[PDB]
XYZ file of C-alpha atoms in Angstrom:
760
model
C 15.635 11.477 -3.435
C 15.120 12.729 -0.274
C 17.202 15.548 2.007
C 17.292 16.251 6.013
C 16.576 20.176 6.458
C 15.769 22.060 9.345
C 13.811 25.080 9.516
C 11.196 27.787 11.647
C 8.280 25.592 10.824
C 10.341 22.200 11.656
C 11.356 23.925 14.979
C 8.022 25.362 15.891
C 6.098 21.782 15.076
C 8.896 19.954 17.296
C 8.241 22.280 20.230
C 4.569 21.956 20.139
C 5.322 18.066 19.981
C 7.474 18.631 23.096
C 5.002 20.672 25.156
C 1.150 19.969 23.921
C 1.687 16.471 23.064
C -1.435 14.557 23.667
C -2.285 10.713 24.141
C -5.638 9.916 25.738
C -7.268 8.445 22.453
C -10.674 10.117 22.993
C -10.109 12.937 20.480
C -13.545 13.701 18.414
C -16.887 12.557 19.285
C -17.430 10.056 21.964
C -20.945 9.812 21.962
C -23.000 8.135 24.580
C -27.121 7.932 25.037
C -26.178 10.256 28.499
C -24.360 12.653 26.904
C -22.244 13.488 23.753
C -18.292 14.528 23.783
C -16.229 16.608 21.410
C -12.435 17.359 21.423
C -10.164 19.407 19.139
C -6.260 19.075 19.476
C -5.142 22.525 18.291
C -2.722 24.533 20.157
C -2.585 27.182 17.602
C -6.358 27.952 18.222
C -7.251 30.595 20.080
C -10.890 29.533 19.976
C -12.725 26.557 18.506
C -16.967 26.568 17.879
C -19.207 23.673 17.493
C -22.359 23.624 14.887
C -24.731 21.427 15.161
C -26.722 20.420 12.033
C -29.713 18.210 11.003
C -28.819 17.241 7.686
C -25.316 16.623 6.216
C -26.217 19.287 3.343
C -28.231 22.476 3.144
C -29.738 21.120 0.031
C -31.556 18.132 1.835
C -35.282 18.225 3.134
C -35.224 19.489 6.406
C -31.691 20.601 6.642
C -31.294 23.461 9.152
C -28.496 24.425 11.932
C -29.573 23.790 15.414
C -27.307 25.331 17.812
C -23.550 27.134 18.406
C -21.466 26.360 21.274
C -18.234 26.960 22.410
C -15.553 24.278 23.091
C -13.230 25.817 25.819
C -9.659 24.762 26.696
C -8.785 21.688 28.426
C -7.025 21.721 31.506
C -4.446 19.191 33.322
C -3.263 20.154 36.550
C -3.843 23.618 35.618
C -2.182 23.573 32.408
C -3.110 23.423 28.542
C -2.374 20.366 26.406
C -3.728 21.642 23.352
C -7.317 20.261 23.465
C -10.815 22.201 23.110
C -13.866 19.774 24.893
C -17.222 20.344 25.388
C -20.095 18.207 26.619
C -23.508 18.218 25.253
C -26.352 16.599 27.630
C -28.919 15.093 25.952
C -29.694 12.825 23.301
C -27.649 13.756 20.199
C -27.184 10.868 17.397
C -27.292 11.152 13.849
C -26.773 14.954 14.622
C -24.231 16.660 11.948
C -21.591 19.307 12.872
C -18.169 20.640 12.013
C -16.029 23.020 13.716
C -15.197 26.851 13.347
C -11.449 27.281 14.391
C -9.709 30.772 14.777
C -5.925 29.897 14.872
C -2.690 31.171 13.806
C 0.158 28.553 12.393
C 2.603 26.698 14.364
C 5.606 29.479 13.517
C 3.340 32.451 15.209
C 2.061 30.991 18.646
C -0.019 33.533 20.786
C 0.152 36.296 18.170
C -3.208 38.358 16.838
C -2.687 37.180 13.460
C -5.410 34.393 13.255
C -8.037 32.963 10.787
C -10.999 31.613 10.562
C -11.921 28.024 8.726
C -14.944 26.011 9.290
C -13.532 21.958 9.086
C -15.147 18.654 9.142
C -13.310 16.903 12.319
C -10.153 15.704 12.076
C -11.727 12.361 13.629
C -14.570 12.111 11.640
C -15.918 8.959 11.771
C -18.930 9.289 9.737
C -19.706 11.957 7.550
C -23.274 13.183 5.724
C -22.490 13.871 1.546
C -19.103 14.446 0.634
C -17.568 14.154 4.047
C -17.676 17.685 4.028
C -19.531 17.333 7.519
C -19.134 15.099 10.367
C -22.096 12.969 12.020
C -22.369 11.670 15.865
C -23.547 8.169 14.963
C -23.992 5.092 17.502
C -21.484 2.609 15.879
C -23.217 -0.277 17.738
C -26.200 -0.150 15.988
C -24.610 0.004 12.364
C -23.285 -3.665 12.959
C -25.082 -6.170 10.402
C -26.544 -9.446 11.947
C -24.025 -11.610 13.624
C -21.474 -9.353 13.396
C -20.670 -10.164 17.269
C -19.371 -13.785 15.563
C -17.078 -12.221 12.814
C -13.450 -13.022 13.597
C -10.602 -11.950 11.496
C -9.563 -14.455 8.715
C -5.898 -14.325 8.807
C -3.240 -16.258 7.043
C -0.861 -18.585 9.506
C 1.792 -16.888 7.437
C 1.746 -13.720 5.251
C 3.890 -16.440 2.001
C 1.130 -18.212 1.532
C -1.274 -15.569 0.745
C -2.188 -15.024 -3.049
C -3.661 -11.324 -2.523
C -6.410 -10.441 -5.037
C -5.867 -6.759 -5.370
C -9.820 -5.535 -6.277
C -11.270 -2.315 -6.630
C -15.139 -2.075 -5.171
C -16.266 -0.660 -8.301
C -14.455 -2.733 -10.531
C -15.616 -5.975 -8.584
C -18.994 -5.674 -10.058
C -19.551 -2.930 -12.211
C -20.653 -5.253 -15.326
C -23.640 -6.122 -16.150
C -22.392 -9.340 -17.114
C -21.510 -9.822 -13.262
C -25.044 -10.795 -12.509
C -25.552 -9.317 -9.597
C -28.476 -6.927 -9.035
C -29.584 -3.704 -10.351
C -29.064 -1.940 -7.192
C -25.469 -3.177 -6.008
C -23.805 -2.912 -9.550
C -20.207 -1.375 -7.670
C -21.530 -0.679 -4.539
C -20.428 -2.559 -0.717
C -23.361 -4.977 -1.551
C -22.013 -6.415 -4.707
C -20.125 -8.852 -2.408
C -23.216 -10.138 -0.088
C -24.829 -11.456 -3.074
C -24.284 -15.446 -2.814
C -25.212 -17.427 -6.078
C -24.032 -14.842 -8.579
C -23.835 -16.159 -12.755
C -22.172 -14.701 -15.645
C -25.003 -12.476 -17.031
C -27.812 -14.479 -14.415
C -27.752 -17.405 -16.608
C -26.696 -19.971 -13.891
C -23.851 -21.743 -15.924
C -20.764 -20.219 -14.952
C -20.336 -18.294 -11.506
C -18.731 -15.059 -10.881
C -17.721 -12.350 -8.023
C -17.833 -14.296 -4.661
C -18.287 -17.994 -5.937
C -16.019 -17.344 -8.399
C -13.692 -16.583 -5.314
C -14.425 -19.483 -3.200
C -13.774 -21.029 -6.489
C -10.402 -19.684 -7.255
C -9.327 -19.792 -3.878
C -7.417 -16.785 -3.643
C -6.591 -16.654 0.056
C -6.541 -12.627 0.453
C -8.545 -9.640 -1.505
C -6.842 -6.149 -1.007
C -9.675 -3.536 -1.911
C -8.440 -0.381 -3.505
C -8.924 3.097 -1.356
C -12.409 2.916 0.495
C -11.942 5.533 3.066
C -13.425 8.889 2.248
C -11.562 10.138 -0.766
C -12.690 13.291 -2.668
C -12.271 13.307 -6.009
C -15.427 11.516 -7.008
C -18.640 13.553 -6.045
C -21.264 11.610 -3.843
C -24.072 13.460 -4.720
C -23.404 13.287 -9.024
C -23.383 10.873 -11.992
C -23.060 7.181 -10.678
C -20.420 5.960 -12.993
C -17.701 8.116 -11.905
C -14.356 5.708 -11.243
C -11.838 6.971 -9.472
C -8.925 4.890 -7.633
C -9.086 6.832 -4.742
C -5.614 8.563 -3.744
C -6.784 11.481 -2.704
C -7.473 11.137 0.910
C -10.096 13.354 2.847
C -11.540 11.350 5.940
C -9.091 8.391 6.665
C -11.684 6.859 9.431
C -14.773 6.909 7.397
C -15.929 4.722 4.306
C -15.966 6.120 1.162
C -19.471 7.196 0.445
C -20.257 6.334 -3.197
C -19.776 2.717 -2.596
C -22.838 2.747 -0.879
C -26.680 2.873 -1.831
C -27.008 6.364 0.317
C -24.606 8.487 0.991
C -26.677 11.449 2.344
C -26.752 9.106 5.790
C -23.622 8.104 7.435
C -25.000 5.304 8.921
C -25.736 3.573 5.845
C -21.578 3.623 4.480
C -20.531 2.312 7.648
C -23.435 -0.327 7.707
C -22.480 -1.641 3.708
C -18.768 -1.609 4.418
C -19.046 -3.313 7.215
C -21.715 -5.971 5.399
C -19.091 -6.127 2.504
C -16.449 -6.927 5.165
C -18.551 -9.496 6.711
C -19.492 -11.353 3.407
C -15.662 -11.977 2.409
C -14.911 -13.079 5.783
C -17.721 -15.213 5.174
C -16.205 -16.560 2.069
C -13.189 -17.633 4.101
C -11.028 -14.731 2.250
C -9.313 -12.142 4.175
C -9.468 -8.726 3.347
C -6.550 -6.299 2.616
C -7.312 -2.463 3.251
C -5.445 0.011 1.134
C -4.301 2.966 3.010
C -2.850 6.336 1.553
C -1.551 7.931 5.169
C 1.189 9.400 2.902
C -0.599 12.487 1.804
C -4.224 14.519 1.498
C -6.369 15.653 -1.263
C -5.610 19.124 -0.884
C -3.683 21.246 1.908
C -7.392 23.115 2.540
C -7.916 20.207 4.917
C -9.151 19.256 8.192
C -5.352 18.865 9.726
C -4.684 22.371 8.107
C -7.509 23.902 9.659
C -6.890 22.596 12.794
C -3.314 23.742 13.038
C -1.867 25.434 10.366
C 1.679 23.980 8.933
C 1.838 20.931 11.580
C 0.403 17.742 10.153
C 2.859 18.443 7.090
C 6.539 18.567 5.848
C 7.113 21.839 5.089
C 9.499 23.209 2.844
C 12.397 26.321 4.558
C 10.698 28.641 1.939
C 7.020 28.177 3.680
C 6.128 26.225 0.324
C 4.506 22.430 1.039
C 7.075 19.467 0.124
C 5.535 17.465 -3.007
C 7.355 13.989 -2.246
C 4.421 12.430 -3.123
C 3.276 14.476 -6.326
C 0.217 15.934 -5.084
C 1.804 18.717 -3.946
C 1.810 17.836 0.073
C 2.910 14.913 2.224
C 2.052 14.153 5.433
C 4.618 14.286 8.203
C 4.602 11.007 9.904
C 7.662 12.200 12.176
C 5.179 14.318 14.006
C 3.884 13.168 17.679
C 0.440 13.545 16.887
C 0.291 12.766 13.276
C 2.135 9.419 13.968
C -0.610 8.909 17.009
C -3.480 9.431 14.352
C -1.966 7.249 11.598
C -1.720 4.293 14.322
C -5.111 4.916 15.996
C -6.708 5.204 12.403
C -5.371 1.367 11.501
C -6.133 0.242 14.663
C -9.412 1.574 14.288
C -9.939 -0.039 10.657
C -9.221 -2.989 12.016
C -11.191 -2.965 15.248
C -14.387 -1.438 13.730
C -14.556 -2.984 9.835
C -12.750 -6.006 10.370
C -9.876 -5.534 7.952
C -6.724 -7.907 8.366
C -4.150 -6.096 6.829
C -3.046 -2.902 4.885
C -1.234 -1.793 2.229
C 0.870 1.681 2.166
C 0.668 4.050 -0.929
C 4.033 5.889 -1.524
C 5.589 3.917 1.588
C 9.145 5.934 1.227
C 7.612 8.539 2.214
C 6.786 7.450 5.733
C 9.410 6.963 8.081
C 10.776 3.838 9.700
C 10.380 4.569 13.346
C 6.933 5.034 12.703
C 5.885 2.168 10.395
C 8.110 0.193 13.513
C 5.836 2.149 15.952
C 2.599 0.795 13.706
C 3.551 -2.502 13.113
C 4.230 -3.465 16.890
C 0.927 -1.502 17.541
C -0.962 -4.277 15.026
C 0.974 -7.082 16.265
C -0.872 -6.068 19.474
C -3.778 -7.112 17.873
C -2.791 -9.720 16.120
C 0.564 -10.488 14.526
C -0.819 -12.079 11.217
C -1.942 -8.871 10.289
C -0.319 -8.220 6.700
C 1.267 -4.882 6.349
C 3.154 -4.109 2.991
C 3.564 -0.881 0.570
C 5.693 0.727 -2.266
C 9.227 1.482 -1.137
C 9.628 4.515 -2.715
C 8.843 8.063 -3.352
C 6.799 10.283 -5.647
C 9.500 12.906 -5.467
C 11.980 15.229 -3.744
C 11.346 14.824 -0.264
C 12.531 17.523 2.419
C 12.013 16.208 6.157
C 13.803 17.408 9.305
C 16.680 15.087 10.852
C 15.343 14.075 13.076
C 11.773 12.402 14.497
C 9.662 13.259 17.566
C 11.663 10.484 19.773
C 15.157 11.976 19.212
C 16.085 9.193 17.000
C 17.641 10.272 13.351
C 14.904 10.199 10.364
C 15.050 7.297 7.721
C 12.421 6.929 5.323
C 10.788 3.558 4.913
C 12.288 3.071 1.164
C 13.753 -0.100 -0.199
C 17.313 0.931 0.722
C 16.426 1.005 4.026
C 14.668 -1.947 4.150
C 17.638 -3.659 6.267
C 16.044 -1.179 8.860
C 12.364 -2.030 8.001
C 10.791 -4.846 9.730
C 11.064 -8.168 8.532
C 7.263 -8.300 8.572
C 6.529 -5.308 6.917
C 6.744 -6.707 3.042
C 8.169 -4.091 -0.132
C 6.615 -4.756 -3.400
C 9.665 -6.312 -5.267
C 9.929 -4.008 -8.184
C 13.255 -5.958 -9.176
C 11.351 -9.545 -9.704
C 7.911 -7.217 -11.338
C 10.602 -5.841 -13.724
C 12.723 -9.107 -14.083
C 9.085 -10.901 -14.933
C 7.349 -8.604 -17.485
C 9.387 -5.756 -18.153
C 9.959 -2.332 -16.406
C 6.622 -0.493 -15.600
C 7.777 2.889 -16.880
C 6.986 1.917 -20.394
C 4.410 -0.910 -21.402
C 6.086 -1.841 -24.509
C 9.399 -2.604 -22.530
C 10.182 -6.463 -22.703
C 10.902 -8.343 -19.890
C 12.475 -12.055 -19.213
C 9.091 -13.571 -20.259
C 8.573 -11.619 -23.283
C 12.353 -12.991 -24.690
C 14.649 -10.716 -22.709
C 17.650 -13.067 -21.506
C 19.533 -10.054 -19.161
C 16.242 -10.011 -16.774
C 16.825 -13.616 -16.119
C 19.139 -12.660 -13.385
C 16.572 -10.301 -11.988
C 14.086 -13.727 -12.083
C 16.507 -15.861 -10.817
C 16.957 -13.544 -7.726
C 13.449 -12.863 -6.805
C 12.755 -16.344 -7.611
C 14.106 -16.070 -3.464
C 12.419 -12.836 -2.520
C 15.992 -10.791 -2.765
C 16.549 -12.337 0.311
C 19.694 -14.346 -0.872
C 22.138 -11.798 -2.360
C 21.289 -8.592 -3.727
C 19.917 -7.136 -6.642
C 18.773 -3.581 -6.396
C 17.977 -3.958 -3.449
C 17.728 -7.254 -0.649
C 15.280 -8.763 2.048
C 15.606 -9.568 5.495
C 13.569 -12.451 4.851
C 11.025 -13.667 2.065
C 8.265 -12.177 4.583
C 9.490 -8.903 3.418
C 8.650 -9.106 -0.156
C 5.406 -8.974 -2.021
C 6.547 -11.283 -5.081
C 4.171 -9.719 -7.913
C 4.172 -8.240 -11.513
C 1.221 -6.268 -11.572
C -1.168 -4.284 -9.552
C -3.521 -1.543 -9.831
C -0.760 1.207 -11.110
C 0.490 1.040 -14.466
C -0.247 -1.758 -17.123
C -1.621 -5.137 -16.089
C 0.282 -8.079 -17.293
C -1.708 -8.901 -20.022
C -1.316 -5.185 -21.201
C 1.946 -5.170 -21.039
C 2.571 -8.590 -22.869
C 0.463 -7.550 -25.782
C 1.746 -4.311 -26.064
C 5.741 -5.549 -26.223
C 4.831 -8.493 -28.432
C 2.459 -6.663 -31.207
C 0.729 -10.151 -32.034
C -2.830 -8.555 -31.452
C -5.208 -5.595 -29.586
C -5.506 -5.119 -25.853
C -7.762 -7.773 -24.246
C -8.471 -9.834 -27.517
C -6.932 -13.400 -26.729
C -3.616 -14.226 -28.298
C -1.713 -18.093 -27.681
C 1.816 -17.048 -27.472
C 0.579 -13.750 -24.862
C -1.703 -16.783 -22.693
C 1.871 -18.791 -22.717
C 3.719 -15.545 -21.489
C 0.921 -15.219 -19.053
C 1.130 -18.698 -17.685
C 4.467 -18.510 -17.589
C 4.505 -15.388 -15.453
C 1.929 -17.024 -12.849
C 4.216 -20.057 -12.649
C 7.351 -17.527 -11.697
C 5.304 -15.343 -9.279
C 3.911 -19.134 -7.645
C 6.834 -21.295 -7.507
C 8.677 -17.831 -5.463
C 9.325 -17.560 -2.269
C 7.071 -14.675 -0.024
C 3.818 -13.356 -1.088
C 2.347 -14.112 -3.866
C 0.674 -10.820 -5.312
C -1.859 -11.027 -8.267
C -3.860 -8.052 -9.490
C -8.038 -9.021 -9.511
C -8.717 -10.469 -12.994
C -5.051 -11.257 -13.666
C -5.878 -15.072 -14.163
C -8.478 -14.087 -16.523
C -6.153 -12.250 -18.725
C -7.662 -8.524 -17.150
C -6.963 -5.926 -19.877
C -7.251 -1.955 -19.597
C -7.170 -1.490 -23.731
C -3.640 -0.727 -22.919
C -4.296 2.230 -20.829
C -0.890 2.995 -18.786
C -2.677 5.403 -15.583
C -6.383 4.552 -15.408
C -6.616 6.454 -11.755
C -9.763 7.991 -13.344
C -10.572 6.557 -16.763
C -14.160 5.239 -17.639
C -15.261 2.995 -15.295
C -16.341 0.430 -17.982
C -12.824 0.535 -19.253
C -11.707 -0.347 -15.534
C -14.376 -2.580 -14.449
C -13.181 -6.293 -14.936
C -15.016 -7.806 -18.035
C -16.557 -11.110 -16.458
C -16.800 -12.597 -20.030
C -13.035 -13.240 -19.236
C -14.149 -16.320 -16.767
C -15.582 -18.145 -19.700
C -13.185 -16.562 -22.770
C -10.100 -17.232 -20.590
C -11.072 -20.635 -18.339
C -8.412 -22.757 -19.221
C -5.712 -19.519 -18.053
C -7.789 -19.445 -14.655
C -7.659 -22.832 -14.422
C -3.505 -22.858 -14.994
C -3.580 -20.066 -12.260
C -5.783 -22.069 -10.128
C -3.368 -24.789 -10.174
C -0.071 -22.826 -9.560
C -1.949 -21.903 -6.537
C -2.170 -25.093 -5.143
C 1.526 -26.193 -6.262
C 2.614 -23.077 -4.349
C 0.223 -24.015 -1.464
C 1.805 -27.817 -1.211
C 5.151 -26.825 -1.067
C 6.895 -25.352 2.229
C 9.966 -23.807 0.389
C 7.744 -21.644 -1.480
C 5.724 -20.455 1.049
C 8.706 -20.110 3.809
C 8.662 -16.988 5.574
C 12.616 -17.246 6.521
C 15.317 -17.936 5.053
C 16.003 -21.825 5.558
C 15.458 -22.678 2.548
C 17.796 -20.241 0.652
C 20.984 -22.483 -0.100
C 18.648 -25.487 -1.457
C 17.698 -23.334 -4.254
C 20.752 -25.572 -6.242
C 20.230 -23.366 -9.456
C 21.810 -24.901 -12.458
C 23.302 -21.790 -13.730
C 24.848 -18.462 -12.212
C 22.190 -16.470 -10.588
C 24.114 -13.319 -12.437
C 23.780 -15.387 -15.759
C 21.944 -13.973 -18.559
C 20.128 -16.981 -19.651
C 17.200 -17.982 -22.048
C 16.561 -20.886 -19.552
C 16.154 -20.742 -16.288
C 16.250 -23.894 -13.430
C 16.733 -25.007 -10.443
C 15.287 -27.394 -7.875
C 14.288 -26.812 -3.955
C 15.334 -29.739 -1.509
C 12.186 -29.776 0.819
C 12.455 -31.230 4.097
C 9.122 -31.175 5.751
C 7.536 -34.431 6.555
C 4.581 -35.576 4.697
C 5.188 -33.594 1.579
C 7.203 -33.587 -1.938
C 10.745 -34.053 -0.800
C 12.538 -32.115 -3.721
C 11.017 -30.225 -7.198
C 12.091 -28.938 -10.276
C 11.392 -25.873 -12.021
C 12.607 -24.523 -15.299
C 11.275 -21.219 -17.116
C 11.991 -21.270 -20.570
C 11.416 -18.366 -22.582
C 12.619 -19.268 -25.635
C 10.747 -19.456 -29.023
C 11.678 -23.156 -29.019
C 11.260 -25.977 -26.697
C 15.055 -26.500 -25.331
C 16.394 -29.364 -23.292
C 18.077 -28.120 -19.774
C 20.443 -30.535 -17.814
C 19.735 -30.076 -13.975
C 22.904 -29.460 -12.108
C 21.622 -31.393 -9.620
C 21.645 -35.284 -10.509
C 20.333 -36.601 -6.889
C 17.263 -37.363 -8.163
C 16.473 -39.115 -11.896
C 12.994 -40.240 -11.781
C 10.252 -36.981 -11.580
C 6.474 -36.673 -12.093
C 5.871 -33.450 -14.032
C 3.120 -31.850 -12.092
C 2.958 -28.854 -14.783
C 4.102 -27.554 -18.144
C 3.138 -25.151 -21.360
C -0.486 -27.044 -21.235
C -1.935 -27.658 -17.988
C -0.972 -26.971 -14.109
C -1.773 -28.976 -11.187
C -1.412 -31.461 -8.582
C -1.699 -34.014 -10.528
C 1.019 -36.290 -12.662
C 1.182 -35.157 -16.257
C 3.522 -37.073 -16.875
C 7.207 -38.548 -16.119
C 10.765 -38.228 -16.443
C 14.112 -40.467 -16.320
C 17.107 -39.103 -15.396
C 17.495 -35.269 -15.034
C 16.982 -34.005 -18.315
C 13.708 -31.941 -18.976
C 12.844 -31.276 -22.900
C 10.957 -27.871 -21.856
C 8.211 -26.370 -24.451
C 9.071 -22.835 -25.932
C 7.719 -20.054 -23.713
C 6.421 -22.298 -21.152
C 7.543 -23.169 -17.762
C 7.545 -26.940 -16.305
C 7.554 -27.886 -12.661
C 8.442 -31.192 -11.549
C 9.028 -33.492 -8.301
C 10.344 -36.416 -7.019
C 8.432 -39.825 -7.659
C 9.281 -41.297 -4.187
C 8.269 -38.235 -2.757
C 5.198 -37.489 -4.708
C 3.926 -41.277 -4.181
C 4.808 -41.194 -0.466
C 2.808 -37.723 0.429
C -0.326 -38.416 -0.927
C -0.987 -35.123 -2.086
C -3.604 -34.779 -5.172
C -5.641 -32.963 -7.227
C -9.576 -33.013 -5.896
C -10.241 -30.888 -9.076
C -12.150 -32.307 -12.109
C -10.578 -31.385 -15.584
C -12.149 -31.322 -19.785
C -9.828 -30.869 -22.077
C -11.344 -29.327 -25.044
C -9.427 -30.149 -28.613
C -9.737 -28.365 -31.688
C -9.841 -30.983 -34.536
C -9.952 -29.864 -38.294
C -12.198 -32.818 -39.287
C -11.606 -33.887 -42.697
C -7.331 -35.130 -41.459
C -7.728 -35.300 -37.677
C -4.971 -32.754 -37.757
C -5.338 -29.955 -35.241
C -6.285 -26.667 -36.252
C -5.186 -25.229 -32.550
C -3.640 -26.507 -29.338
C -5.809 -28.195 -26.981
C -6.733 -26.556 -23.451
C -7.178 -28.113 -20.385
C -9.964 -26.674 -17.919
C -10.375 -27.363 -14.130
C -12.674 -27.095 -11.223
C -14.025 -28.253 -8.308
C -16.207 -31.675 -8.716
C -19.708 -30.455 -8.955
C -19.235 -26.913 -10.092
C -20.289 -25.878 -13.360
C -18.360 -24.684 -16.549
C -18.704 -23.600 -20.283
C -16.266 -24.097 -23.541
C -15.849 -22.030 -26.373
C -14.504 -21.991 -29.813
C -11.020 -20.477 -29.204
C -10.571 -16.846 -30.347
C -7.335 -18.014 -32.081
C -8.583 -20.392 -35.015
C -8.964 -18.194 -38.490
C -12.657 -16.947 -39.272
C -12.165 -18.850 -42.356
C -12.854 -22.374 -40.311
C -17.055 -23.079 -38.739
C -17.160 -25.326 -36.307
C -19.356 -28.055 -37.966
C -19.497 -30.459 -35.157
C -18.742 -30.530 -30.889
C -18.210 -33.927 -28.897
C -18.654 -33.866 -25.666
C -20.850 -31.820 -23.442
C -19.703 -28.301 -24.764
C -21.216 -27.163 -21.267
C -21.883 -28.873 -18.170
C -20.281 -29.834 -14.447
C -16.833 -31.116 -13.730
C -17.033 -35.024 -12.706
C -14.003 -36.785 -10.560
C -13.596 -38.838 -13.959
C -11.835 -36.769 -16.541
C -14.160 -35.605 -19.463
C -13.354 -34.726 -22.976
C -14.766 -31.807 -25.838
C -13.985 -31.982 -29.332
C -14.208 -28.501 -31.636
C -14.342 -30.152 -35.231
C -13.930 -27.738 -38.183
C -14.634 -27.558 -41.974
C -14.137 -24.674 -44.605
C -15.803 -21.559 -44.848
C -16.428 -18.059 -46.034
C -16.640 -15.404 -43.827
């Protein structure tokens, strides 16, 4: 819910915006070898004092207060524009500082009831430990080697993306990642090429694993400066980071040395450079909708201005943390826009994800979208189109237009290149996020088939709980950092095994969900480690749980190499068919669904008439969430010869069979993807990945104890195969044919685990 209220705080802030608004783009430190400059926009302040130090804290050896100066009012044409400036002559690099602002609030300008605060610069670019002290860094110095040649690694269309939502700690915090001792959980785990599981050199991990999996984007969890982890305390502290402190300053606990401010910048840039060199785009999660506490730099500089104030004087609780930034405000809007531009231009990020996007206002988001477009329009923007609580915001914004929250309901006003995370498809696929045990479509819910069928088109065709101006305004996904993981939800709802423990039926549902996400329009978005069945031990909220519980268990790239390969093949499927990555609604009417989109059906099916030259001319798709195989007849009978390219066992770009007519026998809880034979033969799209088939044969009779699984990978890359974890303990591998480990050769290989009786 949201309400439009006006009060004394809003009127005073509007007057401030009308009079004192500033647009010089040079607030904060403007360091040069000749002289340093400082600027603080605070109309309500009676005086500002700058305090230079030598160490970002008093507990560091050699820490001492250097000097204090007084910042005087900045005058243009004799009138005050709200800023306090001072120039220090001489060399001042690496010198910390703070401000001592004596100020009233917005409603009491000119009165003598001031209060004195000591505050880190709102525009801090570098900070000592815990971000409580600024620093005058020379940013040109912190560029790693070859940084001048780094360029944005951007998609041509954000719908082609396969976003990998990766937490910087979890990426490498496991000792099984094989990363050096000093770099487990930092920016620099991303710069180490040649990593492997347990350093054994057999199967890759981390960055080489990313190049293998082919993800086109990686969305990094909050690595701006945040509060909830002590940058000087225990190294095992984990926190997503939704308690922002310094937006413009990289987080400190992800660097080898947080006490020095150049080190965090250097190492963050190093990580971004590493990912850009891996050909993988980088997407920064941002949280401009709130700050850690109201005792912030914004409040200490201009109280009650930068936040939305209720009529009673309390702060609005729309974000659920006790406050919420007033994005409608003439200077906070400019702050957010300039912070986005600064992150992009300095740390070479390629796109953003706005937490609780519903709080921000549509006009501000259109302004940010236009500003990022002015750099490069392929910079991807998206975010959660809701809010955490009741928001009380002004009736208008600083520009004079009405105030509209950026919600899913307002997606019609919100720009089409600002995707809204599709809760509709998320719950249609795997169930409502509010309950971990809820049963979605994949688990067997017939009713959610409507949600899945509408989300197949990015909700941009028709209306189910919301609508998108285009599929480019939809992030097709079923999991992210928030709430439980896909495999967690599947296991919890099925009740077949404990969390993270491999289960064949749950793996089938996971493959089906991957097919649903990767044959749909819009942006494909996956939780990092979602292919390998990542599990948080079922924890529905892990924002600050154990780092060893949130870390990616890198044994899962071996234990779930078949699921990794299914995902890696579905990615190729989606990238090899233009309708599955169309930005606009040109292909909305080609989806000749077999049943009504609103039908509660166990087996979803449809077909896509592609029109791009040199590609498959048609595809079928049949999601069969039933416990038993079911024959599905296509209402589109214009094509009767087909070449399956995915099924319940393996997925990819290679013919897994052929079907005559238009009737497909779809296995239980499994998807089928086909293509027209003529188009397949004429296009020439073919999988260059090697393959391995791992059977599990009871030796005495030749019957299979468990189904075979197909592994996949690039030709020339290694692999490792293991006995299936689902075979009972009463069986013992007596022999293993073929290469139980090795590399992927262009010609298919095989491995057979023969079994016999055993007494555990």
